[PDB]
Design a protein around this ligand. Structure first.
Ligand SMILES: [Zn+2]
Ligand SMILES: [Zn+2]
Length: 39
């Protein structure tokens, strides 16, 4: 259970009102996003 938008656990992007993160909230790259990242 983790937000695929802001990158905070305990919810889902479905539920999240917040706008997306810059890049990989998961791994930390700015160039790519979480959805892009192999991880
Ligand atoms: Zn969120
Ligand atoms: Zn990444």
């Amino acid at each position: 259970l983790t937000c695929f938008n802001c990158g905070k656990p305990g919810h889902t992007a479905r539920m999240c009102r917040q706008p997306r993160q810059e890049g990989c909230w998961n791994c930390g790259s700015k160039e790519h996003r979480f959805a892009q990242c192999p991880k």
